[PDB]
Input
Amino acid sequence: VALVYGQMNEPPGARARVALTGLTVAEYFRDQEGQDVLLFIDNIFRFTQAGSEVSALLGRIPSAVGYQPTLATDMGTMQERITTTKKGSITSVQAIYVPADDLTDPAPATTFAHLDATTVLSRAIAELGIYPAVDPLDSTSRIMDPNIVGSEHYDVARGVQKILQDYKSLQDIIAILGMDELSEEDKLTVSRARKIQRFLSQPFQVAEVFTGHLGKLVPLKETIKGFQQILAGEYDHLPEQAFYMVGPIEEAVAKADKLA
Amino acid sequence: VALVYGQMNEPPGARARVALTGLTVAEYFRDQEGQDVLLFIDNIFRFTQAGSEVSALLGRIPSAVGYQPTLATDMGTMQERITTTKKGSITSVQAIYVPADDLTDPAPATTFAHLDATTVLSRAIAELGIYPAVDPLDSTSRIMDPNIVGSEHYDVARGVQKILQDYKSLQDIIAILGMDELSEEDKLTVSRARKIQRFLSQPFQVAEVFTGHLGKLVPLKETIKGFQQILAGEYDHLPEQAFYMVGPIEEAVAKADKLA
Amino acid sequence: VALVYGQMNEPPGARARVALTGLTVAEYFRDQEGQDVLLFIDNIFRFTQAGSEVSALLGRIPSAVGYQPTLATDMGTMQERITTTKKGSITSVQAIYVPADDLTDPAPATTFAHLDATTVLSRAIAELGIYPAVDPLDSTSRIMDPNIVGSEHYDVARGVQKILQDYKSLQDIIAILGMDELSEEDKLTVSRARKIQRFLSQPFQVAEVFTGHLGKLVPLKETIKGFQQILAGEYDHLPEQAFYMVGPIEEAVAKADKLAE
Amino acid sequence: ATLKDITRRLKSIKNIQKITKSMKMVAAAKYARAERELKPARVYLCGAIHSSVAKQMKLANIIYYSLKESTTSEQSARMTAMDNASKNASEMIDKLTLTFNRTRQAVITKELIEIISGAAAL
Amino acid sequence: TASDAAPLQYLAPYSGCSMGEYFRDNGKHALIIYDDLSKQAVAYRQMSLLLRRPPGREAYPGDVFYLHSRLLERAAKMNDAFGGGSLTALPVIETQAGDVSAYIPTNVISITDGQIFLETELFYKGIRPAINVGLSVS
Amino acid sequence: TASDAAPLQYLAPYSGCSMGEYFRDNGKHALIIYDDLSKQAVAYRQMSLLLRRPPGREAYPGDVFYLHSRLLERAAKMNDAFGGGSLTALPVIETQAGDVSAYIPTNVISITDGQIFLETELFYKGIRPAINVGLSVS
Amino acid sequence: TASDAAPLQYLAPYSGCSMGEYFRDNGKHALIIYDDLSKQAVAYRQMSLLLRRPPGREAYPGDVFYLHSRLLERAAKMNDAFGGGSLTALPVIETQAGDVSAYIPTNVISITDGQIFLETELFYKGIRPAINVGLSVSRVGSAAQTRAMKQVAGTMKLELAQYREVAAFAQFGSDLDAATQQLLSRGVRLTELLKQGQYSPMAIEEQVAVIYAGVRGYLDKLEPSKITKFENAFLSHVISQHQALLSKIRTDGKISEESDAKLKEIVTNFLAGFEA
Output
């Protein structure tokens, strides 16, 4: 990683440009060495704000909500340099701050014009111990189209979510009226869902110096199969905790063994 | 009929003056021939908008909402020629486009004071399927005087408004909890109000292609009457749907049979 | 009493200065005589509106809400003279207008910091016929300290405020969902609150032309006690109306009988 | 509409929605108990309950019957009813929030336009 | 009226006031209705912006309060030393969406000796006059 | 696109329209798709605020309705004496939170000859095209 | 103050910052309170507009964010290589009608490591200090708590978050299960333990002793109305009689299994005493 910094004490113009500087660097590992670089802009809102400060200083009339008249171009001239050219591609993970919790606020609204996916980190999920604490129902992607990820991928994914949704429904019932008017059917959606929820968690190699556990980098193929089978009913006999913090389904099997 | 046009494709100045032009034509028949004129304008809001388009160019500090500081006087010296006099009569019907649906907008807001009768159309009502989408508690007429329409008319009129006003206040509660908790008495206003609301709608020849029904023209006494009875509880047995999209009350009874 | 006047029929200029003249007269008795002064200003907002009225003609870019950019400092160099010193004492009572009823308006908003006690009046309370229309949950005093007024004074006050707050929160809800489902524990606070809400009104001696009631002045102990008892459940039997427009708690008891028929 | 007005309703419809939601979980509970106790007895804001009987209104062995039944039906009724009440309160909390943010935004632009308008006339 | 120049509409109230003071200053009694002070403010706003005076709150001159205070202070009761005559004023102001807290509405409510607030809700409901007891004062 | 100067984004629809007009003008039939008029509107507003024109509702300049009426008036069906040709415009407008009352959406609804409103609810619930059959019109 | 020219009100926070830097740099620790950053922003806005610089939202100059960031960044923890000295800053921002998103409140929130949110509703409801525990934050977190505190802070934080989920139900809880009915009880007692009078800051050892009391469940059968009285007297007692246990807790920095047992008895006998 190369780190580029635009600290909060820097004047508008500096916090304004540092995301371009970082961009410059990344474009090299693509236009000069044709790799697949990763660009991280933390956070995309302070980019826009820096834009407004600069704008105001240049005495230009602000537009709706006080932002810059050039909000959309200031953003476009930067966002657009982030793509897959014939030489390689830059992929950007942008930390978003939504003002006033207003998703139609000009800053945020403009920004979504460019996003192809959202990764929603959730404190609730974390509380399940589940990590990465990504929310499987709130996180989204433009490319989750069978015409793009292929029917299999697309169906598994849509399978995982529905089950996760259904279970969500039952969640209310379980706690109140108690876990049993539950059908041979309603008891399976839960079981699997709970297995799934866990199978969606995973050990990171970045946290090895700490979790005393070995990191896993599951492959896409392994991912779709994994969930495919749980949906399928291939491991309904396996127990929940067999799936907590593992990589490929094979590990779910072996953990079960060590868990008698 | 004489036709004058300065449409949506003209530069601002043309739109700013065609009203004056149609207006002049009408003034000739009124004063030079003591004729009884009919003057239709669609849309007089456009004249004011046109004014706002050139106003900055004339170099004026804008007034509220970016409109020209001369908005009222411009409406005034123009609106004041659209009038009946001792020489001739001008019945004028003017369509007034309300921007963003905001009736507090300087344009429409400043126009109320020039009319004798106003028909305020509502998106909310239209969306319920009631056409014409007239707001019954927001339309008025300086003729709604017992000494002009007769007390029979004056009492049905105020009768209908009172019940719709009453229904209107119950709506907040109806909205979270529905009708269950409502008083037997309150539920009767609600029934009657919903039947009066439907009986206010009607098929226009001009809108036959959309209502799917034959246009109707109801004679005043038929209106005064049909509304009396409804008020008077003479149809508390019929279903609401019987009243929707009909002319005279007699057709509402029939529709009820057909609904069986 | 000396009087100084620069009313609403005056040009902005006069209005931007009378307070100064008034305040100047008062500072004399404070310093040159060393006396205990009582300063009444009605209404200090006018000093600030005066300034905003000429501001544009002074060639200034407007700050927010139309105010002049020097509002706070203009207010500061003035408010800082209206004060008690070691030489003399000033007890200033300033009326403060609230434009559009919005307490966040730059003017009313900027003045809170200059006060040791604030009485916030509300059209929502007034509208109910409760005079004086003070808002019990938006009024404050720097001496509302157990170390200064005592714990009986303090526990009652806070006791009265908790219940009015408790009732404020329920208001919007029993509005729709009604009152049956409420716990007898909670329909008693609705009771007591509604009675306190009334016991807080009072017929002023300067508003008989308004209330049609003889003005009552209640002594601090008659107040503390009256509320203490309502809070204690000692009048859950009398009707709310008995507590409306009365002085001391005994008048609420008498009024109950008179109402008893 | 006033942000302060909208924040009152929102403040309160948010509560009504949680109350209402809580009342259903209760209504479901009692109704669980009831469908069981009901079993045996036949071998012998509550929806439109009290009214349905009220309109059409104008021993022991059977007293416990009409009772043991009229409670399953009631706890059934309150349940669904409060289920839709929060369903309604939710459509509103989502509806009012949008009115709140349109206004919130609108108020800020309106002010700035006023300032800019005055600055520009000097 | 509506087609009269802004400055006529603006002046109109002061003009009419002066005709009422004649009676007030001569031990006679006068009553003046300013119908309405809303349209005058607009006229003032227009006249004023066209003079290039920087717009203020809501686009009106920073002195619209003053515009009406100056006028309505003139309605008054003179002592016997001055004829005992008087001038009573009934100014009209138009609210929008029954919002009386509005800046202009309160500007004028803070000058007069009370208000009569009429609500459309009450009016439709049958309560005519639509006087709102609670919000009106003298 | 997103990276071209606002003036080019602003211009784009007029150019495409002229190209569609050749066909309309020669007894032929063209179809023009403006995607989206939402973003053209913000491009034009950026231009207008930078030129310093008074910002109005939503900071949009007073003539944004005309930015659109002029454009969409050009779609049209000529008669035989003029070729019988035609131009059909399917302009796109992006609403925020299904709010079809906003300034821009309303503007555009008051220009075209019907709308096709797609609903997010419908879309997730699996109804696609997410058309709202009661609200939409022709 | 109020009558001092704008520029002095503007400067004040920097000139106070420098003063605190002398300590920071010299291996010493310094605390700085800016009361308020709202008024200084106003002072700055006033000069900006009078010098005719361009006005942005709320009439604030484009460099108002930079005025505070360059101020609040001068606070920091140095490295031993530099003296290990520090500068902590407690900046105050006055919101309006709780609009934490207004301009200046947005900047400063965005610059600092956490916020202590106070609320009127809470204040008048009896929670004083009015800290809204759900929205308050400390990016630094436990990296700054003592092991003693953590030993307790941690479960308290958690039952509270849990109460906050159910709290609203209380007032209409016509029939809640004893599971959640439990969290409402822990909820109101833990909340009463967070209450506090002014001018009487406590020693970390006194805070954990009291927190332990409700967190462990000892005040669960006690009346909400009495927790304030309990703590007061309970704490008076151990500050009197038990200064050796507190000295332990203090020293050992945590609650040993022993001192744990000693506290159990101290509270179970005091409580008994208490409800006699």
Q: What stands out?
A: The domain at 144-260 of chain A is CATH 1.10.1140.10 (Bovine Mitochondrial F1-ATPase, ATP Synthase Beta Chain; Chain D, domain3). DSSP finds eleven helices and four strands in chain A.
